[PDB]
Amino acid sequence: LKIIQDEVNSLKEMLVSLDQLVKTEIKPKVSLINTAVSVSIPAQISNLQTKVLQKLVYLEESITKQCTDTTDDDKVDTTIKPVEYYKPDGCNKTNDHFTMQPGVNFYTVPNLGPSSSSADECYTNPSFSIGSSIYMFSQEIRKTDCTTGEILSIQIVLGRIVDKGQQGPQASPLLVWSVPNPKIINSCAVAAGDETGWVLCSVTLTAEPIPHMFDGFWLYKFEPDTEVVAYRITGFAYLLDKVYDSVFIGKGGGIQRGNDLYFQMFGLSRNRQSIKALCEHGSCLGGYQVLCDRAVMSFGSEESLISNAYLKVNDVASGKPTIISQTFPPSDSYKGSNGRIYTIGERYGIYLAPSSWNRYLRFGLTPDISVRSTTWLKEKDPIMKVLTTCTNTDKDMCPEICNTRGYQDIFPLSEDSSFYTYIGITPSNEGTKSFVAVKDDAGHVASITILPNYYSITSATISCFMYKEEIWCIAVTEGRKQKENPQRIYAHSYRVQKMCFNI
Amino acid sequence: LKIIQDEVNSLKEMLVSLDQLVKTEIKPKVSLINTAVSVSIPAQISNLQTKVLQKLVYLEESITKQCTDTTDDDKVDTTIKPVEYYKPDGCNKTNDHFTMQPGVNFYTVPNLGPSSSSADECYTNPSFSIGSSIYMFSQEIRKTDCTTGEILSIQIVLGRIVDKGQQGPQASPLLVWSVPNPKIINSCAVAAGDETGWVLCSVTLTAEPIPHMFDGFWLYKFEPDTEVVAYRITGFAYLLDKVYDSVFIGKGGGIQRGNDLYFQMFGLSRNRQSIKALCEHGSCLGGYQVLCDRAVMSFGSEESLISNAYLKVNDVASGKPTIISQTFPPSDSYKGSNGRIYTIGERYGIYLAPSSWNRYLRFGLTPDISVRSTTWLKEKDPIMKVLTTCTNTDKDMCPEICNTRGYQDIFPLSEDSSFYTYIGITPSNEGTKSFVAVKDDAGHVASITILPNYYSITSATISCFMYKEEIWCIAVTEGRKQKENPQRIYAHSYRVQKMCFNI
Amino acid sequence: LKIIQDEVNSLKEMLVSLDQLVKTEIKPKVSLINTAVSVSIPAQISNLQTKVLQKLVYLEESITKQCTDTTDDDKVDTTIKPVEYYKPDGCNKTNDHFTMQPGVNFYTVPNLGPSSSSADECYTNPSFSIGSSIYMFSQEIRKTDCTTGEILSIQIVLGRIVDKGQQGPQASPLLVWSVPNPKIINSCAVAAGDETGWVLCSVTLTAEPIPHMFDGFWLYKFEPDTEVVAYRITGFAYLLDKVYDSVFIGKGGGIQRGNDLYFQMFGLSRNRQSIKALCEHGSCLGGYQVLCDRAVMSFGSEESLISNAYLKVNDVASGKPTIISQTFPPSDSYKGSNGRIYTIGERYGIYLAPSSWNRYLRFGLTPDISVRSTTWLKEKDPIMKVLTTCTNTDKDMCPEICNTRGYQDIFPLSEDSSFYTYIGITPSNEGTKSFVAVKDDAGHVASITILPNYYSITSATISCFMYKEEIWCIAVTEGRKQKENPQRIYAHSYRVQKMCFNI
Amino acid sequence: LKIIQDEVNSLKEMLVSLDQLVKTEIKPKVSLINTAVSVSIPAQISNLQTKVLQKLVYLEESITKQCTDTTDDDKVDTTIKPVEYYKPDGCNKTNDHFTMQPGVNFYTVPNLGPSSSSADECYTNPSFSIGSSIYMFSQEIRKTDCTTGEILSIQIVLGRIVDKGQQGPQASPLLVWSVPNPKIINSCAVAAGDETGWVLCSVTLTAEPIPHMFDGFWLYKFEPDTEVVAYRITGFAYLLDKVYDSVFIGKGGGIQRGNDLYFQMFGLSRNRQSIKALCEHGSCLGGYQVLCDRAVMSFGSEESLISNAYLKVNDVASGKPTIISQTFPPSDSYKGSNGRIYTIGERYGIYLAPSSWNRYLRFGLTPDISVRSTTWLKEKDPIMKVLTTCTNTDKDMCPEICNTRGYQDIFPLSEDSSFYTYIGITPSNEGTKSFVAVKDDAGHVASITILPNYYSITSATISCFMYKEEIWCIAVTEGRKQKENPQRIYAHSYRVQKMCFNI
Ligand SMILES: *[C@@H]1O[C@H](CO)[C@@H](O)[C@H](O)[C@H]1NC(C)=O
Ligand SMILES: *[C@@H]1O[C@H](CO)[C@@H](O)[C@H](O)[C@H]1NC(C)=O
């Protein structure tokens, strides 16, 4: 028996030595190689190409004629920049119209994140954000039913945007992570800054979880070639404006400004006051105001409303972050829904998806992130026409009790959001049809048809950046190639052209 | 004893942690690196080379004179395209003949798939197909005897065709897989489409297997960076036209059209009717018709015939595929054999290898995959002269009872198969001799000798594609370098030149 | 029980086989790949770029006009060279002043060595040295308190300086190692030569260690793709000039000359003689001499002084090295401190950091490494203004009892150190401010502000080399990006410009 | 106890699964990556460089003026070719002398094979051969004493010669292997052909081994990405001409011609006849003939001689090789020694190292590998002056009883070996001095000094090939950098220039 208690001890020493070898020598070197081949070499080849071709241009000029700063110094990878809006330089003449249009191509961006073949799995609720160099992506994997199924796993993919010699920008994953205990999460969303990514997840109560109940938040910090740091925000670490029974983090993601993070949230809150719901519609014909009020109530109850709010995460650098919210009144909003926080130069913007009877674009601008300073846009495009149970029309948009569960955001191409890019989706008898469009400040829309070989697309989120000194955008969508396929997440890219037309 | 039940439990935790590390971190990163070095970097360097050289061409033009679309957007890798047939543009003049000829080079394409040195192993029955970007390859590994030996393993190698700076196209393996329980498989064949590969295997009964008996099929789906999905097709999931005792899948492979797969099959079927076998021969001299009838019977039995059939796999996207066959009558065919399904523009073609007394090319064209719509070609070349026990001549091809076990297919270079490329093999007293040839529509054959340093080549299969805007072909053959070597699978490439001769 | 003693034995055989596979096949190949992607490929691409661009230059010259040695042969990597000082070629004219200035850029050099996110860890006491091709880096990781905390680990990173297509030189790690039993080390420092690195560590006594006691040294030899060789230097293997109770190795590092190594050391030594401390100051007004004497005493004791010494490691190639020291008298120095040994052509230099009341630059030159041959410079810049408890002024620098714990070295750009480069740090109410400067031989200083987005920088060490045929320097600093961050080590690079001004 | 017999079984399943994963997925992919980064990418970049630079040359020609085959098709890697001797094209004029000289550079070729830092290990007896694309290298590792120490291991390194953008050719290892049971091996040598390497080892008897006794041979076959195949040649599988008590394989290596291998061997053989030893010397003055006879006897015994022989390995492709030898008479040779077999066009050559009193070059040519057809050269250079106990002079070379244990071979640069390259070594009071030289057919020697920073070099072997269309040579030597270093194996390269001088 001593030899046994001895032989087992021998196995322990051999197993520990092997485990140390894999963690100490091999894992580190494999990570270094991944970066060298996926990021660094492509960057070196790209710089070579640019310099050689530019010299050849000077030779072309010479033959015909003779016959026959400080800002990028702290950057690791300078392939992309934050968006620098186009200006009408020289388009201030009589009858000379400055506009923007999408290009004719819609290129694939493969391997944005991992996937699978199992028909029992569904990929949904993508959250995508592009920072100054890096991108954050997150995808929920649910069992069978996509919307009401169990969460099997949430996957976060930190990576970089690089130039690989293709017609558009390409993704390069550096770190993939799987959130522990996914079964107790209501929702997660991402945010990104300078070489740092953030994830904020809202969690629930347990008895096995108790569905859509609220019990604080988790915050995760992601860095290149570094371990993930988790923080628990509970107890007195958070303060909500209204009392919430159920809290969700808005799908579209958040932003980082200085030492604070901003996210959009929505949820089910307690109410002890009468309301006058916002009720804007066309020439439909008292009854409509009643419907507008019942449209924001949970189960028709005067005391429990579904509403939107701003969520601020304070002082992240201290290691002990706190959360403070500010809620929108029912008089200046519609039934609470998934939204997104934008940074627009020195100003901010907010997108709120349709979820009720009003299917018009709801997007606002503000000098600071607060409720009382928000000014709403008067544009209508896009109108959400999919994943809805509403029977009203796109002209009058009359109030009724119905629901919508889609998401189609926009990306501002100017400081006042007078110009913007979006993807439209129209239902048909054979899946869906869709297009890319840019709306100008005169109300005109330039549009090009996309993805003719996909059975259906149900959603879209857009993030733009500078690449090769012009604006490029990446769109992430959910859909199916063939009618019988499970739902998967796809990504494509396109360019925005500057044009000026002499009328 | 508790410390033992404790020390063992400690080993379990350490072993699980190590296993998770290798599967979670290392395997994924190694796969990403393989793609980066074998596919992505080569693509980037190739694009650089093309752009720089083209600019230099413009400079050459400048000096002398002054003194002294939407289709590839959804593609991951655009190195190759489906074949675009050459047209006689400007060869419509009097006495001006449009033709095609092979080039003078026959380049090696190394590492198409893995191999071994053991003299106890034989590599045979290759199945090769090139899709829109990817290729599928499969090789059987048998013990000692090559044809009648036990199957040790079947290996499937999914990979891509890339440009590595060599004189021709090169292979780049991405995924290698070994079919489980190979001992119960009669045969497997491959098919490929757009980034998806398929494998169909016919299986037998068990008591240890019972030789050449039939018990349904297995279908496997292969995708890049994805797990392999297997389906069992048995019970009422398949319906055969005739009752078969033994079913084999044709070696040459199949195609994918829309949501269906098409394969060629052959096997031993029950018969209750009299027959009049197809019996076409030259000026040999009642007795011949009798021999032609007994040539298609198993063991001379009127009731059991060996015949060919089309095999269709219906609705693969549903996850629950079914199989339906359609059998060729004995009056329009010869003893059943290994064949191949071709896609020729909007039309289809079928190749049937010689297996009996008739050794002439048997190839047909059809508007749809059915028996009654097939029209057979009247060309003879190539004539199979190897691996045969027949003693007839190449002129009269007189009926007798004999067998042939080779395979030499062709690849159409025009919609009506009036032009095509093939490899001829002629036996000698020192292994074999062979050549590459292209037959034109006037019946002329251009040919170039190949592989002068190989003792023998016994078979060949050809797949063609566009590369660097001209047609290139890859030939996969079985053979031996030196007389005493075991049989191995080799691959080489060549180009097809466009020529027009003013007579 | 036999089956158990048998099943365990089976596990042993399987575990040994697996461990051998990882050590024999995989580890070696991973190391070879790391070099190929991080060093060899970048070198090949860089050489291509240079040759192509130079040819294009000749074409530019041709168009306009016609219209419209043996020294690097033994080198593995020729990207960098030892510094070749600039000369005033053609600046010997009347009113024509030869000078040197820093460039305007300060580029990031990422991944010089590994790091971490834990807030409980602090990275301090960096030691950095650049050899003929390779570099040595070492960083101490302490728990919580940075200066008085426990040592958790010391990490040594041997690597190479390479060209990766960026604006400046970049680091490429080859070997990372962790010194065993870090808890018994007083301090470590690095040195580097031709493809060989060295580390010298001073160790203490144990009872758990006994704080700042002395018990000999360890020497480690580092080579590329090779195991680390350790030597113990104790007993009669070392001889110190004075009797030391506590010995530390100077932070800045040492040099290799022929078969010997030279390091700076300092420590607490026994004294039986009266002293007259060096006491140089300005127009402050007997009392000052008394303060100057008590400033070099430990706890005010006449018998125990803190002093500097040279440390020589003799005959390293024999495998049995020995150590001999030579101590500086209190009459020609100040309280002992961290320093650095320099090689300046055929001559040597020594830097001694401020640690007491005198905060002016203390740097000397010598024809050989000995105390009696050292001649001190009369320059003042830089003056250390951070990490000090002194209340004197930068003009008079009056004696008092105080302490300083910073480190800001210089790098000579000429044989007589009449020109040199340094980094200045000035404290403010919001962390610190800093700049890069080059002082010329007329006493003028050219300076450029750096790192505007870093809350604070507390130290700097500079190493220079030739790159792309001009002098480039890498500065390694300790600091924080945001006020609440833990301390981390950062590295940046800049260039030194040659200028000549016609007055 | 059942739970124990159960928990152990669980560990077995987990360990087997992990072992299969590492062998099935990871090992294969790592090997593919090594080739991609070390061989394939460098080849692609090199081809780019050549094509771009050649176009630029044509542009240079254009500006000034206008103003201001089938043989490599079967090759995997075409970087190098077998030597094509230079011809005096246009040097057939009066007073116009055709010659060859070495270049001035002697470049390092790093990582030819692995090494170590342990001072207890010595690397000796290198065997190096270059084939049509690949190279074979083998190094013995002995404990402490280098010549009489125990063999710890023999390491074989199969690799390729590639272009990495450096001034000369570089090595790229693909497969490293360690011969099992090295303790029973007398000696090993390598040979190489077309993508196949061979190793032949002579083994001894065991009681623990019995020193220098003979018991047959082992043959190993090495192929890229393939397992090593071993064969035992014993019993009646070999037949030696004379009866040998002890057999060694000549250090320099062998060749492959068709299906046979040729090696040089030497050993201790039985003798029953009187002898008349070859005794060629200068004007020294019966006694000398007696010394010449005793110089070839073992321990002075008439019945036991030390002699050379040819060793042929017959029919390697069959898998059952046999060995037949043919011995040189004492009347046409000197004491047996290490030699080398050369292929010189259609003819063969043999090199025999000095081992006795005659220290002049001994090299012969033959139309076939046999004793009776060998014709010896009359050149003297090089004369071996190191590792000898002889006291005779380089002029008369008088017979005595002494021994020499060096090795300095030559490489023919012409069909008749009238031109050749060699490395000379001259002893001094400070290690050794050496040079590279080329001897022409007029007896003139061009020489250049090498390795000025190496304490000593004791041996050299040379293999030449075509690279960038001119002859390049790699020399492998044994030596020490610093006096106190252990012996290690180094490799360097140089070029042979074609010159023609008008007198
Ligand atoms: C050949 O076809 C071209 C059109 O592709 C036509 O322009 C030309 O006239 C035709 N030539 C003859 C001889 O028919
Ligand atoms: C040298 O040989 C060339 C042929 O290679 C021949 O044309 C020439 O005339 C010869 N010159 C002399 C002097 O023989």
Residue numbers in the entry:
A (entry chain D), B (entry chain A), C (entry chain C), D (entry chain B): 75 to 142, 166 to 304, 308 to 385, 390 to 607
Task: Show sentences the authors wrote.
Langya virus (LayV) was recently found in shrews and isolated from febrile patients in China, representing the first human-infecting HNV from shrew origin. HNV infections are facilitated by the attachment glycoprotein (G) and the fusion glycoprotein (F). Upon G-mediated receptor engagement, F is triggered and promotes membrane fusion and viral entry. LayV F and G are closely related to MojV F and G but distantly related to their NiV and HeV counterparts.
Formation of the 310-helix results from K85 being oriented away from and L86 toward the core of the coiled coil, positioning them in hydrophilic and hydrophobic environments, respectively. To maintain α-helical integrity, K85 would need to orient toward and L86 away from the core of the coiled coil. Therefore, the K85L/L86K mutations are expected to favor α-helical propensity in the LayV subgroup and LayV K85L/L86K GSM had a twofold enhanced production yield relative to LayV GSM. To further our understanding of the role of the K85L/L86K mutations on expression enhancement and rule out a possible impact of the oP4h tetramerization motif on the overall LayV G conformation, we determined a 3.2 Å resolution structure of the LayV K85L/L86K GSM without oP4h. The structure is virtually indistinguishable from LayV GSM with oP4h except for residues 82 to 89 which adopt a canonical α-helical structure instead of the 310-helix. These findings confirm that the designed K85L/L86K mutations restore the continuity of the α-helical stalk in this region, possibly explaining enhanced expression, and show that the positioning of the head domains relative to the stalk is most likely an intrinsic property of LayV G, which does not seem to be affected by stalk modifications.
